[PDB]
Curated annotation (Swiss-Prot), chains A, B:
Organism of derivation: Homo sapiens
UniProt gene name: GMPPB
Co-factor binding details: Coordinates binding with substrate and required for enzymatic activity.
SUPFAM superfamilies, alphabetized: Nucleotide-diphospho-sugar transferases
Effect after changing residue 185 to C: In MDDGB14; the protein remains distributed in the cytoplasm and has no discernable changes compared to wild-type
Residues the record lists as binding Mg(2+): 110, 218
Protein name per Swiss-Prot or TrEMBL: Mannose-1-phosphate guanylyltransferase catalytic subunit beta
């Protein structure tokens, strides 16, 4: 099939991470999240996907042009200079996606599940109308478009009603199979697919709703980034137990990259994903954390529920907790305490942050 | 002469403006500050200028090499790959600054003053020694690197100083004359000139001082940028009053580019620097505020002590004050009070913000 991941957004949620690199090139469990979705597409049999680029096209173009030939598929990219939202990508790319009368796949980048492409195309053949979404039921999140669905038919009566769920209990997981007939309904203008097309789509009855098995998380937020990392390591425990590292100083599910290094007398606790090149010295405790490429974590420090970005140097006897995000090349001095520090890139910290702040 | 302007330190201070363009290329009084530097250098009579370019290398050099042909002076660019601090620059360009036994200018990226290049190059020869610095008198020397000198030689005993040094009352204005033998005190490793080379040169007896005559300011902080603005607009009233705009609603020292347009029945207050293309609508009271390029400020707004970045949109009845700095392409919604808001680029604000805060 031909597919489409709209990957151009300014990652304003997940901001210090998405200041250096784009949001799809943020390394999520030792492999970028665009690479997760496009690798699942290549597993599903989609022959062709094109990126819908708006911002930091350089790095995305380079890495994706390499991974094009990495795996046997023709993957081009549609470039936009003015950000047309998440719908204008459809009409910008309508030149090649209005060729045949076959449905195309539109995914958010920031969504990680296990991807039922074949189950949803099996779903989409039944109702035969324009658009299919998949949805996920969680109680507390209402950020996305919360949807109202039918019985095992699945037809959408209503969606996009504002937060005050009241027993709806289904939120759309941002993945669509659209017919090419709705390609002409969208126009070139800066438009959002989530709140412009889909409302009249829902009052027309053309959306249908496949709902998902389990392990879904959107990881556009750093707290949601660590929660999705927890879920993804749980799913890898239930699927590939040999990938998760296992030793005497390893608790729970830990995803150590082979290029990484872990010193002795150090307790890498549960739900940790060390990146390619990290140096965790002798005596560090790390639980629930994400450490990205080339980040050195010096000895006797204690990290819980925090993202440590690229080329960071965390000093000795440092305590970082409560979802602390560090940008690229952030240097924490020794014996400091960071609580909720959102640190921008290229900043050396010599002073504790005892309350959640944006260090700038 | 040869000049060496250090221009590749990341502008961590005055951050939402330097998260998009480099600190040398941010607009200060409608011109990049680096262009103030090299234009007064080319007026004074240096042969060429070496730039030390690390951070946003391509976008800075893409304008610098287009300006060198228009100036009439040559430009070399010592390309920093690791950022070698603020002294490792002239260790990188050692062979360029070692072509002849000659003092060379070393300049900072942030300083703006009446650059006294010829009086400085007259002063450096009389004292004989290896290096001379341009100092300036402050009002209150509370916490900055302060300098204590001699009576008529200016032989500075001690250079760098942590606070409660009250006896000094003189600071480094960021301009240095340097003989090539200082060039063989340096090493290719990353180092600072204020931290280590000037400290041992004030141990030697080579470092000499000569204080300026008014209007010095850095633009490293954003409030320091705003007081430097007017420190410059008071200068443009004192020296070349033709450049400053004057009109019925225009009061005080205002700078307006010819592309900038202003509706009627408004009140542009003193110390305003409207950049190129900016659209000021009806009834918009702008005072003490620099408005960078392509920024639209909608009607009935009030702005005081503020920096509006590139291509921002300020809504109707918005009250922005207290060094509220908007980054590039920040859309402020109507009827909103912003006080202290540092707003990161590509971010829309729907709530008013009463307390000083970074919006990430
Ligand atoms: N190609 C492209 N993709 C876009 C554009 N705007 C949004 N997207 C995509 O929309 C997807 C999901 O939307 P969001 O969850 O709100 O993420 P976002 O674009 O980073 O926006 P924020 O709310 O600021 O985080 C993101 O993965 C983006 O890649 C665009 O203008 N061009
Ligand atoms: N080429 C280069 N120049 C630098 C580097 N670091 C500092 N400089 C220069 O050193 C001079 C003094 O530094 P600062 O005034 O503190 O400016 P800054 O580099 O933006 O750093 P902060 O204001 O502290 O964020 C400036 O002219 C910088 O351009 C560097 O790593 N590479």
């Amino acid at each position: 099939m031909k597919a489409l991941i709209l990957v151009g957004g300014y990652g304003t949620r997940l901001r210090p991470l998405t200041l250096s690199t784009p949001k799809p090139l943020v390394d999520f469990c030792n492999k970028p999240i665009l690479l997760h979705q496009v690798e699942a597409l290549a597993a599903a049999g989609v022959d062709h996907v094109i990126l819908a680029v708006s911002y930091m096209s350089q790095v995305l173009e380079k890495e994706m042009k390499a991974q094009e030939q990495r795996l046997g598929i023709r993957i081009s990219m549609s470039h936009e200079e003015e950000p047309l939202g998440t719908a204008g990508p459809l009409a910008l790319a309508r030149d090649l996606l209005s060729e045949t009368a076959d449905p195309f796949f539109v995914l958010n980048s920031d969504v990680i599940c296990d991807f039922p492409f074949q189950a949803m195309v099996q779903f989409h053949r039944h109702h035969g109308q324009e658009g299919s979404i998949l949805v996920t039921k969680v109680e507390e999140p209402s950020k996305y478009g919360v949807v109202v669905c039918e019985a095992d038919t699945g037809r959408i009566h209503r969606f996009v009603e504002k937060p005050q769920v009241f027993v709806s209990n289904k939120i759309n997981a941002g993945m669509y199979i659209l017919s090419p007939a709705v390609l002409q309904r969208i126009q070139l203008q800066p438009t959002s697919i989530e709140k412009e097309v889909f409302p009249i789509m829902a009052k027309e009855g053309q959306l249908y709703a496949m709902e998902l098995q389990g392990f879904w998380m959107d990881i556009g937020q750093p707290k949601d980034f660590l929660t999705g990392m927890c879920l993804f390591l749980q799913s890898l425990r239930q699927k590939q137990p040999e990938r998760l590292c296992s030793g005497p100083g390893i608790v729970g599910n830990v995803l150590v990259d082979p290029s990484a290094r872990i010193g002795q007398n150090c307790s890498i606790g549960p739900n940790v994903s060390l990146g390619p090149g990290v140096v965790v010295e002798d005596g560090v405790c790390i639980r629930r954390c994400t450490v990205l490429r080339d980040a050195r974590i010096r000895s006797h420090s204690w990290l819980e529920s925090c993202i440590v970005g690229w080329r960071c140097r965390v000093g000795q006897w440092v305590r970082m907790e409560n979802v602390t995000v560090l940008g690229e090349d952030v240097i924490v001095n020794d014996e400091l305490y960071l609580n909720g520090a959102s640190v921008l890139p290229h900043k050396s910290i010599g002073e504790s942050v005892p309350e959640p702040r944006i260090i700038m």
